[PDB]
Amino acid sequence: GQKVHPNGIRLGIVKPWNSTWFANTKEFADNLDSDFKVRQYLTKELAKASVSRIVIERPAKSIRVTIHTARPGIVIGKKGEDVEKLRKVVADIAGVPAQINIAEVRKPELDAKLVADSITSQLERRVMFRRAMKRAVQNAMRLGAKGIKVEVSGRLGGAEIARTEWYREGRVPLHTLRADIDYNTSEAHTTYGVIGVKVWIFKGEI
Amino acid sequence: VIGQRKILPDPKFGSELLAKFVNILMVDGKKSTAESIVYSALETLARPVRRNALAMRWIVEAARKRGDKSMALRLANELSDAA
Amino acid sequence: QDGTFDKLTKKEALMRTRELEKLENSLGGIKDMGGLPDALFVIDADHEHIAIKEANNLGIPVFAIVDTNSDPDGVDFVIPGNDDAIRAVTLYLGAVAATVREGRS
RNA sequence: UAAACGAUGUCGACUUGGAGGUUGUGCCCUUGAGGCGUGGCUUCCGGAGCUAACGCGUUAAGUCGACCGCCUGGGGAGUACGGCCGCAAGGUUAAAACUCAAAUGAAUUGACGGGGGCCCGCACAAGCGGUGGAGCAUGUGGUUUAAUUCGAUGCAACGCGAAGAACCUUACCUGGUCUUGACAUCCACGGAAGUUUUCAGAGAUGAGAAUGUGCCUUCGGGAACCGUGAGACAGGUGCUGCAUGGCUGUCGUCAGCUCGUGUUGUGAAAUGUUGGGUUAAGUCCCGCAACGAGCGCAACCCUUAUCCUUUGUUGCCAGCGGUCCGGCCGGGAACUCAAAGGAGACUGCCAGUGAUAAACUGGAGGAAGGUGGGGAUGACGUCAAGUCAUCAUGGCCCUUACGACCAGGGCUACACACGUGCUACAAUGGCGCAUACAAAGAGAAGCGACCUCGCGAGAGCAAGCGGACCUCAUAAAGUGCGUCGUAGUCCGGAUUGGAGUCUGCAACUCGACUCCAUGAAGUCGGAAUCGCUAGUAAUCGUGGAUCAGAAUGCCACGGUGAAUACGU
């Protein structure tokens, strides 16, 4: 490889942790494994809910999983029954009386995960990716983000040869550690090969 | 270009013309042993970085396997022969 | 000013500024209405032919002084005098400054 | 007859310039040139114009006029035939059939370009320490075996995946066994599961014996699980890493890579992205048809150095008190220290050099001097580099089966070829005794103290500690004295034996270490090559990961702590 992951290197910088609990070595592995258990059956059950982040935190023997979604209505449901049923699936797969908080993700096409997911959604629907990848390229420009990069990976179009194309616009100073780079990836399970997508969102300095 | 390293003068006598000598007869970062080597040889006997360095290195470099009681005192004999 | 006050340390800001004011001698000369030039006056036509070329490309009248080497082709209001002997060109400069400063009347 | 060429017919006229050479000549210097003309020839720049462009440009390829010669896609072919000419020698005139869809000019980009320079770099120079010799550790190829599992296999594989192989492990094999399967879901039948059992087997399992039969029981059956029945299906460390994703190494923390707008060009395209310097730097100044911008460089992030503020414990003890004299306790909050925040370093200033500038050279202050130091951070792209065996995945393959379980044994087997090491090969020393000064870490099936036994692996008892509170843990090197006197040795520890000591169902395969006991090979190693410019090489210890147990390996910590640089 060549590149560092922009989000994790800024973990001690403007990018905040999306898993904030303090636990000892004894429960650290169990809590971390419990985090993956609650997360794996939280994104899978909300694959069409525009989930941006799933932040986990354990104040006192009860985790409070807040979900960043651009469409809270599908996650909340009618009068919060969907959060309620998801809550008791988290509550018994995490061992704690968990509760699920919800947060609207304003300006959805400006989220790294959502852009990666949105492109991935309309990528296996048998459409040409040149226009599809520009849609995230174009949409971000009118709504700020004075810097962005949307890279796609191998098996671009029905072919036996892998390709790569990224089509930068704006400025993406990934070397600058206070760049506040929103970055996330996704992969598309197409009938041929696997196509991974990678997007960087430069939401201004600090 | 850059100059050679400046070393503080030998504290024991406050003189710069002895520290460079004790640093090369030194082996394996054992300066403490080095005084046990040369001070017993010195306190009891009673460009400037090219020819002085090279010539004086030749003195130190022949005391590895000469086969006697101890080259700690043999080098004292060698410098006594030199002096 | 407030950049040195709040964001940048004084030393680094002062050096970047110190290396950067070198151009506002030309820049600040043009900000009264963001430029929008309507005429140009050039004292040495040949030595600054580039300006004449851009001006006539934009279809702008040109006020030029040509002596022996430059050409009247690029210019429309030619002033066939010297580009040197600073007294004469400064007299032209004072004259044009005045005659644009009673144009409003 | 010639590339007989300026590849440019002859003649005339007209149309801006600049720089020459050669040869006349007029005026005035009546010195020889001279200064100013004025002709002819001629070389080179360039304007308009012209040209496809290259170019030509008053010696036109401009603008015209007169006349002549010539051309009409490439090849066949300046060939055949005839004529004429010639001493044959050949020349000249000059076809066609046939075939091809081009052939061609000029210019653009960028590719070998074995005609260059320039710059930078422990790359060389200097110096330091080494590897290739040996014994072991590990890894790689090769030999056998059922298997010695698979992949990695120049620099960018070879103490690699594997950061840890007695079974399991482990993907391999021998044997036994199961076929909706050990693992997942769905349908049905039963029994609760669970617990106590035996018997045959190695177990997987099978044949039996007791208890239970728990919450609803809305009376079924669920709530769970187990066994069985047919089916879908499961399952695969199976195969393609040139199908891939993802992730990684690679040139290389090298400095370049491009874009917007402009400009130039009919145009492909060029410019930007250039010289001088300058930087570590496409770092930046100066003149430049380009200005800018993006990723690039720096810096922002972490650590370290000085100081300050805050808090003062489990940390410290400057002052006071006496001390079970030990910060031990009052007590002090000074100081170290601890962790939070700031200040401080910015060529800031000065001198000089340098274009005055960039920049550099030194100095001053400053703890830190010229990005003070070290980390993190790797541009477009480079290797169809590697991974399908971490995972995901396209296709392919076996579904009473390379599937699966179990037991066993493999994976560590050698006869070698080489890495990577450690042990070292000792008298800057080794052994014996007193023997001081570290940091950094970890500890609950745990670090485990004291004491006792114990030659020790150690064992028994068992305080404390989930921790600036106790343990790991006496750090060695170092110091003082004595001693060993070149002895293949007091070094060195392989190898081999008795017994252990711990871990586990179980260690011989194939654990570690020790008590005791061996005690060889190794006295510096071949061309060659590797790493290194400061707390750096070079030593010595410390802890941690993985880990029931299993570090010469890895990661991190400290102590002691060097020498060299003339330059490309």
Distance A170 CA to D277 C1' (A): 34
Resolution to 1 decimal, in Å?
2.7
| Experimental technique of record | cryo-EM
CA of A9 to C1' of D372 (A): 26
Q: Three-state DSSP class for C40?
A: strand
What's the token pair of residue A16?
Answer: 């905040």
Nearest nt (C1') to B25 (CA)?
Answer: D428
The per-residue b/e assignment along C6-42, b for 16 or more CB within 10 angstroms, e otherwise, is: eeeeeeeeeeeeeeeeeeeeeeeeeeeeeeeeeebeb
Amino acid C93 reads: L
Q: Which long-range contacts (CB under 8 A, 24 or more apart) does C36-45 make?
A: C39/C63, C41/C96, C43/C83, C43/C89, C43/C92, C44/C70, C44/C83, C45/C70, C45/C71, C45/C74, C45/C75, C45/C83
**In the structure, how far is the CA atom of residue A51 from the C1' atom of nucleotide D224, in angstroms?**
35
- DSSP state at residue A165: B
- Tell me the C-alpha distance between A161 and A159, whole Å: 6
Query: Do residues A186 and A138 lie in contact, with contact meaning Cβ atoms separated by under 8 Å?
Result: no
Q: Provide CB contacts within 8 A for C77, sequence distance 6+.
A: C61, C62, C63, C64
Here the contacts of A2-8 (C-beta below 8 Å, separation 24 or greater) are A3/A174, A4/A174, A5/A183, A6/A174, A6/A179, A6/A181, A6/A183, A6/A200, A7/A181, A7/A182, A7/A183, A7/A184
Distance of CA C57 to the CA centre of its chain: 17
What tokens were used for B11? 């504290």
Q: How far is the CA of A2 from the C1' of D139 (A)?
A: 29
Q: Are strands A194-202 and A181-189 parallel, antiparallel or unpaired?
A: antiparallel
Instruction: Find which nucleotide's C1' atom is closest to A12's CA.
Output: D301
Report the run of H or E that residue A88 belongs to, with start and end: helix A81-93
Which nucleotide is closest to the Cα of A188 by its C1'?
D245
**Cα–Cα distances in angstroms (integers) from residue A67 to residues A55, B9, C9, in the given order:** 6, 68, 40
- HSE (side-chain half, CA atoms, 13 Å) at A127: 13
Half-sphere exposure of residue A148, counting CA atoms within 13 Å on the CB side? 25
Task: Return d(Cα C39, Cα A140) in angstroms, integer.
Answer: 42
* C1'-nearest nucleotide to the CA of B67: D486
Chains that touch C (3 or more CB pairs under 8 A): none
Residue A103, Cβ density class (10 Å: 0-12 exposed, 13-18 middle, ≥19 buried): middle
Q: Measure the CA–CA gap between C97 and C105, rounded to whole angstroms.
A: 14
Measured from the Cβ of residue A155, the count of other Cβ atoms closer than 10 Å reads 18
How far: B83 CA to D199 C1' (Å)? Answer: 99
DSSP secondary structure, A11-52, as one string: TTTTSPPSB-----HHHHHHHHHHHHHHHHHHHGGGTTTTEE
Sheet architecture: strand order including A148-152: A148-152, A194-202, A181-189
DSSP label of B10: B
Q: Which nucleotides of D are covered by protein (CB under 7 A)?
A: 126-129, 242-252, 263-264, 284-286, 289, 292-302, 344-348, 358, 376-382, 384, 392-395, 426-429, 443-444, 466, 477-480, 484-486, 523, 534, 537-539, 559-567
Tokens of A121: 């959604």
The residues, ordered by sequence, that sit 6+ positions from A115 with a Cβ below 8 Å of its Cβ are A109, A136, A140, A150, A184, A199, A201
C64 and C45 Cβ atoms separated by less than 8 Å: yes
Report the amino acid identity of residue A90. V
Which nucleotide is the nearest neighbour of A191, by CA and C1'?
Answer: D394
Per DSSP, what are the bridge partners of residue A68? Answer: A53, A103
